[PDB]
Amino acid sequence: MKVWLVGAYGIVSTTAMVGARAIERGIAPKIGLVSELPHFEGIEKYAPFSFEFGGHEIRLLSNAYEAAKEHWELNRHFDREILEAVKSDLEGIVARKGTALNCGSGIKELGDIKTLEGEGLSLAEMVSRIEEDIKSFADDETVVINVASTEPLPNYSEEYHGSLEGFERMIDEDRKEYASASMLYAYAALKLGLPYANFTPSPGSAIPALKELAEKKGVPHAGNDGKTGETLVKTTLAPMFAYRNMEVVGWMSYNILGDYDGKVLSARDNKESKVLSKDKVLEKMLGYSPYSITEIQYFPSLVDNKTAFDFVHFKGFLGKLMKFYFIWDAIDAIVAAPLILDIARFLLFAKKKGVKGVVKEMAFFFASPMDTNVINTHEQFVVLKEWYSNLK
Amino acid sequence: MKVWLVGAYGIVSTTAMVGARAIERGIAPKIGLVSELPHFEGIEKYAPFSFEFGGHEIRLLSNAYEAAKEHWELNRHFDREILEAVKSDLEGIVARKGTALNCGSGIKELGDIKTLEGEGLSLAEMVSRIEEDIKSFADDETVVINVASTEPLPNYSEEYHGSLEGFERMIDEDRKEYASASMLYAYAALKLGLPYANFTPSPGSAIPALKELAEKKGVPHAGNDGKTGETLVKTTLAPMFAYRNMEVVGWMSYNILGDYDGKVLSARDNKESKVLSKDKVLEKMLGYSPYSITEIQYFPSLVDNKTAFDFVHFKGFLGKLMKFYFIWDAIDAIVAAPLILDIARFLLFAKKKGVKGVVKEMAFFFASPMDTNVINTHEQFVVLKEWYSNLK
Amino acid sequence: MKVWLVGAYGIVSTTAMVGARAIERGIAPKIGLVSELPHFEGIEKYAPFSFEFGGHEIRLLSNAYEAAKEHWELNRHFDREILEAVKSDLEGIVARKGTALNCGSGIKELGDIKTLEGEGLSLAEMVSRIEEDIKSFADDETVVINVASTEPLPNYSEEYHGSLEGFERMIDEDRKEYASASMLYAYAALKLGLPYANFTPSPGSAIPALKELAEKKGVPHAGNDGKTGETLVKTTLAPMFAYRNMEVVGWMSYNILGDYDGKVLSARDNKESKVLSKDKVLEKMLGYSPYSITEIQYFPSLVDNKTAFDFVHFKGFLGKLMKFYFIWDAIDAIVAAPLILDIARFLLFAKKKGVKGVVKEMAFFFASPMDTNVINTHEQFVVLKEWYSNLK
Amino acid sequence: MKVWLVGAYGIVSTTAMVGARAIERGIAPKIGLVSELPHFEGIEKYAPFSFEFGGHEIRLLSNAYEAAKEHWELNRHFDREILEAVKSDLEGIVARKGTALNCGSGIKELGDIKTLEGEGLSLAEMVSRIEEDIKSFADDETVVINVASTEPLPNYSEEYHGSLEGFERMIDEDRKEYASASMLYAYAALKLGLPYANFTPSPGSAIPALKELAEKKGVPHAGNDGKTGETLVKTTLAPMFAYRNMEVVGWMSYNILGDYDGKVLSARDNKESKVLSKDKVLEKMLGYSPYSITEIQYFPSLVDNKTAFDFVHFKGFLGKLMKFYFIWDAIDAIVAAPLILDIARFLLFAKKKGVKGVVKEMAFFFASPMDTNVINTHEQFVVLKEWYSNLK
Ligand SMILES: NC(=O)c1ccc[n+]([C@@H]2O[C@H](COP(=O)([O-])OP(=O)(O)OC[C@H]3O[C@@H](n4cnc5c(N)ncnc54)[C@H](O)[C@@H]3O)[C@@H](O)[C@H]2O)c1
Ligand SMILES: NC(=O)c1ccc[n+]([C@@H]2O[C@H](COP(=O)([O-])OP(=O)(O)OC[C@H]3O[C@@H](n4cnc5c(N)ncnc54)[C@H](O)[C@@H]3O)[C@@H](O)[C@H]2O)c1
Ligand SMILES: NC(=O)c1ccc[n+]([C@@H]2O[C@H](COP(=O)([O-])OP(=O)(O)OC[C@H]3O[C@@H](n4cnc5c(N)ncnc54)[C@H](O)[C@@H]3O)[C@@H](O)[C@H]2O)c1
Ligand SMILES: NC(=O)c1ccc[n+]([C@@H]2O[C@H](COP(=O)([O-])OP(=O)(O)OC[C@H]3O[C@@H](n4cnc5c(N)ncnc54)[C@H](O)[C@@H]3O)[C@@H](O)[C@H]2O)c1
Ligand code: NA
Ligand code: NA
């Protein structure tokens, strides 16, 4: 299958590419791949483990190997022998210039960038380049996945976001104020009849306009925002207090990280998308609102080794207060990268099975899952297993 | 309903009694009570929130109020106004002298004790006092729950434990070597047609002899070992790694506590029952065996404020190792005490609904649940909800 | 001796008062009192353990017992028997209405307040009430200590802060813009020839104008900002990396707390005083600047139980990076309150020994110590011991 | 200078060798070297940064490069380019067969070993091989440092350990029962007039017999047991509670590690040497005995990445209990290896300055420092600085 990655030179993107190749060459295990669990045996009938890659970027590098290597130098998150083994493969992956339209002040942290909008292109002209890029690469087994930097909250517009007609009128009118890069890539993917997933808390296809487009086109889509680390633990652990009839009175989540993701998320406007995603999970599992504080701060020495410190203050029998602490220490690209490959496979599977619109049953992968109130990790995994079984 | 508590003067026992009374008087909330979750509405039809208490003990105190107060002085785990409010009530609860037969070297840590066996009584004579004590208290809504100190592993015997006939032959023969206090209390309870639960990892009714007895008598029973803190987190969290196809390579669980439970568990023979319970959970959820280390050490300054430190070392994508730490800081009697009341209620419910034998669907309460391979906290809670629904 | 406490109804203030009385009555130990260490034996010759209290406040309560009780209800940070024992004593302590001039937006978090400036009083008129309040209480063994809410950074003024003449010209001119409450209380104390200490990071007497005043008057003064918890650990631990020739590349300090101090510090302008104090310590001990992030966030369930999470990322041999984490869990008023009594005693001692100006050798108590580059806790304690020895 | 390393193929030993070479070649910084702090400028006059290596071992490898590489494969604790750069250098370092006499049951965990005693050699014959090995390598700038596996407590003997005459009588009598490998290597080193240091808690030269020998020969010696991680933090932090007149009521230290050191220390007899060293530090800094629990458990996934979890329970003002937690996450060989080079340099310095007997002022490096009650890290560092200054 083919995967078009928006933000193709990112650490998550390049690790997914390195990882695909290393597994295909038989020099890495299948650990971390949800699609490789016994319950999903038979997936390879519709979505075998075989990947070709293309994508959009705004940072300037020659190919995905120079990109993967840049990240590897700072993080060393796979062995040099894996880097060497996948070199000629990744050297052949060359991203196309994309759009960073309305992607927030955090974008400046990426350094040297080139964009479609910086060429003077209108919305219609940008959509045409984006679509030409993708359609030149795409086949009948192609999926588009957004792993680009996190955008700020979009400028609100009922008219331009509320219906596909309104959104297409937005493009016709070149009303850039109400468009963001993530909507334009999603629009392009769905217009081309290609399954789409959003690994970020940027809007992407999560607006009614694009939800309507996906349904009309009969195209499956999924998101938003990878649930890889702290939020995974949060949606696994929070239910434990509810099952035991305890009240969570306070929940602190402090996340520190470096690298390009920490760098963009350090900006107050970009950060807001992520912070809301992380916070709002508690109410959806508990029914009520614990005093919740969630922060992300740049901490350059950690690079891609995002560390989270959580503190849960909870009441039990006779109103007595008690304390739980956790510290999560992992490489963000390690927990994220296989999920990209898993999502591509589940999207292709769903496409072949005639699924269209929001694949709500893919909630398990996401911190802000579209069209569902299933947030509990355990319930989500059951829903994913049962969905697949019902379609296999 | 009536509850006979073996280890009636313990901190868990006395807190359950204090808590029952405080709720009944309307000066405490219902927080911590699983039987009070919306899904279990209607339980009060069969098991209303109303408790009378008796029990067995070996430590010397006048009544359960002097006992509750002893623990309260060191822990202060409920307000003085709760202590005062429940005083005359608990003053009327007077334990009967029980047996500490083969309850391990840790028993010495309890200080001044008196026992049935120290009177020179045979197994048959001890069973008769135990049964006379219970039957004098019991009615048709009475349950027996063991919350006594944790015993060592029992002396192995196929003959005396393997069948009810063999066990009754053991008593007839006064073969004390193959009996423990927890089996004798369980035997007495089941012989009297009373539902029984074991909040400890002592054998209790978890031997084939007594399992056979419960079935024959048509009596429901449950256990073993309250899952209140570290083991709860372990059975909630471990599944998260499996769902994400990660390998747990190492799991450290270090528990430090004081008070009488830490004191008895400091003894190497008693400790073994608990350590096995805590450890064996991982394999049953994962399918394989992470390098697992579990320890309990006495630490007197903490008193009943058991603190656990856990460290999970795990592999993900491309074999990369990552780290998760947690620290649990709670009052053991706070997380345990409502479960005693919940168990009494669910046992009475099951009794009225014609349930008999091991109530495997009560696994949710226990670290070593009898007759089940359902260990996952989420699966256990679903099983408990579905069980109740199917019987309501 | 007598102690005038600015912010007399605060949790630190009222705990110091409760604590003084309880020790004097012989129902509490002397634990926590630096002035009670063997090395300071003989202090009682000049500053015996004997305290009378008065002070300024802006929150509305009848006396210091109602104030201490308000905090005790939420925190329970000493036993009810201590509360009862010190009741009639604290009932006789009645604060006088003070000034909250330019004390930042965080002041609004205190609820119902009354102030001198809200009466329409000029700077000269306010200074006269403040001075009349203090001088009516003061004797030849009286000290003034500021434990009021933390102020924002003051409005900068070379002219009005740079010399005593400029500062007195500020008052004559009623130029409120360049005055804050903490400077006015400090001015009043020093004008009255009374030793002064600032337990907060508010400016207080730490401006050249007031430093000049203290010298002229021959009066000892000390500050700023109690070093009680996270910053104490930081100044104890940081030196360990320097001694071992390791480079600290990153230091995260995250502090969460509730109660009135967390409430005022939640305001972005007030918070800035504290955050700078906490951060700048590293450079002064290390010679260089680790990437340092320090935050304080309100977290109401913790009340006065401030919890800090720190993360130290450090390089050693061959440039290899390593990790250290700590979690501090204490009651802020517990670590602060004895230091108030200690400071009063050391200030009276210094006064009797003819010390005047900044008592730099009291650095040990403070996170922003005036007139010194001694920050290391170990060096500070040696300096304090040697200072006292040289004057005893 | 030359350094003879007992346990030459260990991870600490081989990292010190790799590190020496990498610095000398100018491809690594001087971070981690105490001898490279500004205060020790001028050391290079007597002990320049220049190292040749030999040593004793019992595990079977061809040379120190194959040994360093074995550890590097599992730990990756320096870059492959460092490994490559120092290859031909380390290939030329070939250990001589040593003795593992009375080195405990933990020795079995090392796998395939060959020893002098396994040849049938008496004590006198073994001492002669050990001495011939060392004297063939040694010059006038040679030091012997023990970095071999930790031994159990020795068999007690006043006669054979109490005086040099008694110890030499032990050898003459071939009384192996009262000798251990570490005493024999130390004896050999001192008999040859060579400075000696013990990086382990094995006895080494810390018996009166050998202390007497070192004095007679006019030879400087140092130890015992590297203070690199948890014990360093403990001796840095404990003083903070004393300075503030707080009582430490409990201190938990839990250490988990893998690799050969964790493997040998997993044995109950070997472990005892280390556990006593770690524990006894508190009393020497505090004057009293907090309830202290210290454990070391094998945890193979961590390899040389020893992780410690500490919990400090402490009383302050009014007897209120408070909590401090730390987690130490480092590579043991990283914090240890430069100290080996530092110790060699300080020993050579002391030798040239006419120092003889126990160099008590090297306490700073050690968890069980010989001939001193200075345990506080801050006091130790001052003593080290002042010692050097007084001799430079
Ligand atoms: N565990 C995780 O790493 C994780 C978890 C949840 C969400 N996410 C989200 O996934 C995304 C990728 O994470 P990452 O660590 O790889 O970040 P990254 O910065 O390394 O990669 C993102 C890439 O996108 C490019 N980019 C930014 N805006 C673009 C645009 N408009 N069009 C095309 N390219 C653009 C950047 O130049 C960069 O190369 C981020 O949004 C992140 O917040 C990551
Ligand atoms: N969170 C928890 O507190 C928790 C969780 C799981 C299991 N448990 C188990 O529940 C039990 C109670 O815990 P606790 O903190 O109340 O301990 P506890 O020591 O305070 O109470 C146990 C009581 O049992 C009495 N006893 C001991 N052996 C007896 C015997 N053979 N017959 C009659 N009485 C006997 C003791 O004197 C004591 O009063 C322990 O076995 C404990 O390990 C507790
Ligand atoms: N461990 C610690 O508690 C600690 C450590 C370092 C610094 N401090 C500082 O000490 C101070 C007291 O801490 P706390 O917990 O008692 O806070 P608190 O809010 O309980 O007490 C401060 C009191 O000052 C009063 N106040 C505010 N502004 C005033 C003004 N201008 N004039 C007179 N009264 C005023 C408030 O009404 C309040 O009663 C705070 O500034 C705090 O940041 C505390
Ligand atoms: N941070 C630290 O690594 C640290 C801190 C304090 C103390 N120490 C001590 O330093 C020593 C070395 O630590 P390590 O991690 O390198 O352990 P290691 O096991 O890797 O190295 C020790 C070497 O000594 C050899 N050995 C054992 N007994 C011997 C004997 N009698 N004669 C000659 N060789 C022998 C072993 O084969 C091994 O190669 C251990 O005793 C350890 O406990 C280490
Ligand atoms: Na805690
Ligand atoms: Na870590």
Domain identity same for A196 and A171:
yes
A264 and A279 both lie in a single domain: yes
**CB contact at 8 A, C13 and C147:** yes
CB atoms within 10 A of CB B62: 11
Cα separation, C317 vs D77, whole angstroms: 10
> Is the CB of residue C366 less than 8 Å from the CB of residue C223?
yes
Which numbered atom of ligand 4 lies nearest the CA of D304? 15
Same domain, B336 and B267: no
Looking at the structure, do residues A337 and A317 belong to the same domain, yes or no? no
Q: Which two tokens stand for residue C134?
A: 């203090």
**Of A329, A349, A374, at which residue does a domain stop?**
A329
> CA dihedral defined by A109, A110, A111, A114, rounded to 10 degrees?
-130
Rounded to whole angstroms, what are the CA distances from C245 to B249, C206, D106, D345? 34, 34, 33, 15
Q: Using what technique was this structure determined?
A: X-ray
CATH code of the domain covering residue A266: 3.30.360.10
Cα(A252)–Cα(A246) distance, rounded to whole angstroms?
17
Backbone angles phi, psi at C296, to 5 degrees: -130, 125
What is the radius of gyration, based on Cα positions, of chain D? 20
Amino acid in position D244: R
Q: Is C351 annotated as a binding residue?
A: no
C-beta D314 within 6 A of ligand 4: no
Beta bridge partners of D327: C325, D309
Q: CA–CA separation, A217 vs D320, rounded Å?
A: 67
Output the 3-class SS for chain C: CEEEEECCCCHHHHHHHHHHHHHHCCCCCCCCCHHHCHHHCCHHHCCCCCCEEEEEECECCCCHHHHHHHHHHHHCCCCHHHHHHCHHHHHCCCCEECCCCCCCHHHHHHCCECCCHHHCCCHHHHHHHHHHHHHHHCCCCEEEEECCCCCCCCCCCHHHHCCHHHHHHHHHCCCHHHCCHHHHHHHHHHHCCCCEEECCCCCCCCCHHHHHHHHHHCCEEEECCECCCHHHHHHHHHHHHHHCCCEEEEEEEEEEECHHHHHHHCCHHHHHHHHHHHHCHHHHHHCCCCEEEEEEEECHHHCCCCEEEEEEEEECHHHCEEEEEEEEECCHHHHHHHHHHHHHHHHHHHHHCCCCEECHHHHHHECCCCCCCCCCHHHHHHHHHHHHHHHC
Instruction: Measure CA of the first residue to CA of the last residue in chain D; give whole Å.
Output: 19
Residues C255, C286: one domain?
yes
- Neighbour-count burial of B288, counting CB atoms closer than 10 A to its CB (0-12 exposed, 13-18 middle, 19+ buried): exposed
Nearest of A139, A132, A51 to residue A351 by alpha carbon:
A139
Of residues D49, D48, D47, D67, the one with CA closest to residue D5: D67
3-state secondary structure of A314: strand
Chain D, 12-41: which have a CB under 8 Å from a chain C CB? 15, 18-19, 22, 28-34, 36-37
Buried b / exposed e along B82-113 (16+ C-beta atoms within 10 A)? bbebbeebbeebebbbbbbbbbbebbebbeeb
Domain shared by A67 and A96, yes or no: yes
Give residues 247 to 266 of C whose Cβ lies within 8 Å of D: 247
C163 token code pair: 């010399």
Å resolution of this model? 1.9
Pair D271, D145 in one domain = no
Q: Are C15 and C77 in contact (CB under 8 A)?
A: yes
CB-based contact C243 D381, cutoff 8 Å: yes
Domain that holds residue B8: 1-228+330-392
Q: Tell me B353's DSSP state.
A: T
Quick one: angle between helices C377-391 and D230-243, nearest 10? 30
Alpha-carbon distance A366 to nearest alpha carbon in chain C (angstroms): 27
Q: Same domain for D208 and D341?
A: yes
Which one-letter amino acid corresponds to residue A252?
M
Q: Give the list of residues 6+ apart from residue C368 with CB closer than 8 angstroms, or none.
A: C201, C206, C223, C224, C225, C277, C280
Tokens 């009175």 label which residue? A249
Q: Residue C302 C-alpha to ligand 5 middle, in angstroms?
A: 11
Enter the tokens of residue D322. 């408070």
With CA atoms as reference, the chain C residue closest to D327 would be C325
- The number of beta carbons lying within 10 Å of the beta carbon of residue A25 is 12
Within 8 A by CB and 6+ apart from D105, the residues are: D152, D267, D268, D269, D270
Q: Distance between CA atoms of C112 and C335, rounded to whole angstroms?
A: 28
Is B197 a pocket residue for ligand 2 (Cβ < 6 Å)? no
Judge if D55 and D67 occupy the same domain.
yes
Chain B nearest CA to A388, separation (Å)? 15
Nearest by Cα to A191 from A169, A172, A218: A218
Number of folded domains that form chain B: 2
User: Residue B160, Cα to own-chain centre: how many angstroms?
Assistant: 24
Query: Of D288, D306, D329, which one is at a domain's C-terminal end?
Result: D329
For residue A24, what are the CA distances in angstroms to A3, A15, A27?
15, 14, 8
For C156-189, letters b (16+ CB in 10 Å) and e give ebeebbebbebbbebbeeeebebbbbbbbbbbbb
Distances (CA, A) of C368 to A256, C237, C267, D138: 27, 17, 21, 54
Report which of C128, C321, C127 is spatially closest to residue C241, judged by C-alpha positions: C321
Query: What distance in Å separates the CA atoms of residue A372 and residue A356, rounded to the nearest whole number?
Result: 16
* Residue B261 annotated in ligand binding: yes
Residue to mutate among B317, B364, B377, with most A CBs inside 10 A, is B317
| Statement to judge: residues B66 and B163 lie in one domain | yes
Q: Are B222 and B268 in contact (CB under 8 A)?
A: no
Sign, CA torsion A222/A225/A229/A231: negative
- From the CB of residue C60, how many other CB atoms can be counted at a distance below 10 Å? 13
Q: Do residues C183 and C126 make contact, with C-beta atoms less than 8 angstroms apart?
A: no
Contact B170, B184 (CB under 8 A): no
Closest CA to B144 of B93, B193, B177: B193
Sheet holding C307-315, edge to edge: C291-298, C247-257, C307-315, C321-329, D321-329, D307-315, D247-257, D291-298
CA of B6 to the centre of ligand 2 (A): 9
Strands (E) located in chain B: 2-6, 52-57, 96-97, 142-146, 196-198, 220-223, 247-257, 291-298, 307-315, 321-329, 357-358
List the one residue out of C50, C39, C52, C35 whose CA is nearest residue C93. Answer: C52
Question: What is the atom index within ligand 4 of the atom nearest the CA of D260?
Answer: 19
Q: Is A85 on the interface with B (CB under 8 A)?
A: no
Helix (H) or strand (E) holding D329: strand D321-329
If one counts every other C-beta atom within 10 angstroms of the C-beta of residue B196, the result is: 27
List the binding residues of A for NADH. 11-12, 57, 59, 99, 103, 148-150, 185, 228, 261, 274, 332
Give the residue whose CA is nearest to atom 11 of ligand 1: A147
- Chain D: list its partners (3+ Cβ pairs within 8 Å): B, C
A62 burial (CB, 10 Å; 0-12 / 13-18 / 19+) is exposed
Instruction: Annotate B228-257 with DSSP letters as a single string.
Output: -SHHHHHHHHHHHHHHTT-EEEEEEEEEEE
Rounded to whole angstroms, the Cα distance separating A171 from B117 reads 89
Final residue belonging to a domain, choices C329, C352, C370:
C329
Same structural domain, B210 and B290: no
C254 and C315 in a single domain? The answer is yes
Tokens 């697992």 belong to residue: B292
Nearest C-alpha in B relative to A384? B243
CA distance linking residue A352 with residue A46, whole number of Å? 7
Ligand nearest to the backbone CA of A180: 1
Non-local CB neighbours of D41 within 8 Å, separated by 6+ positions? none
Q: Do B237 and A236 touch (CB under 8 A)?
A: yes
Report the CATH number at residue C82.
3.40.50.720
